[PDB]
């Protein structure tokens, strides 16, 4: 078996930007793993493509996946609207972790951020799942058109994601 | 503060 590795193309303003990369990691978080590869390939009928990056802070993370609101209240899981937390074996040790965003325990739907430094004030809450592979300039770029309250200046689009391996 | 919620973001 190999780890899953999906990939968004980033579009600013409907501009394309690139692609980025992330290795899934099922071998340690399955089900959560699963609920992006599921999400990214939209083959439940739902997904990612076409949604927005709706809260981006410079220096700490870029969250997504709000795929129904599009703006942190909705999104739902493939596996009903909420799930558990898998495990919390991973930290958020660095630049480039995916993590799962949640509204408390157990509240797992399809938000998710990448971070952009260590958050190890988010260790235990929050189930890190994948890390990004290739395209971690994009992610930076992405950054500059967040702020400290998280408002982007630019509407940053998942413009196509889809399964790599 | 810094926290990734969803529906009620904190400071």
């Known amino acids: ?165 | 503060x810094l926290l990734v919620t969803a529906g009620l973001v904190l400071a």
């Open chain 1, 1 to 165: 078996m190999v780890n899953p590795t999906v990939f968004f193309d980033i579009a600013v303003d409907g501009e394309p930007l690139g692609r980025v990369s992330f290795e899934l990691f099922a071998d340690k978080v399955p089900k959560t793993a699963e609920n992006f590869r599921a999400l990214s390939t939209g083959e439940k009928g739902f997904g990612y493509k076409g949604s927005c990056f709706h809260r981006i802070i410079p220096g700490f993370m870029c969250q997504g996946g709000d795929f129904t609101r599009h703006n942190g209240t909705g999104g739902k899981s493939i596996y009903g609207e909420k799930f558990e937390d898998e495990n919390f074996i991973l930290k958020h040790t660095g630049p480039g972790i995916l993590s799962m965003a949640n509204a408390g325990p157990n509240t797992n739907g399809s938000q998710f951020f990448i971070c952009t430094a260590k958050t190890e004030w988010l260790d235990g809450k929050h189930v890190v799942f994948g890390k990004v592979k290739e395209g971690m300039n994009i992610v930076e770029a992405m950054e500059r058109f967040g702020s400290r309250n998280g408002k982007t200046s630019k509407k940053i689009t998942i413009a196509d994601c889809g399964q790599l391996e």
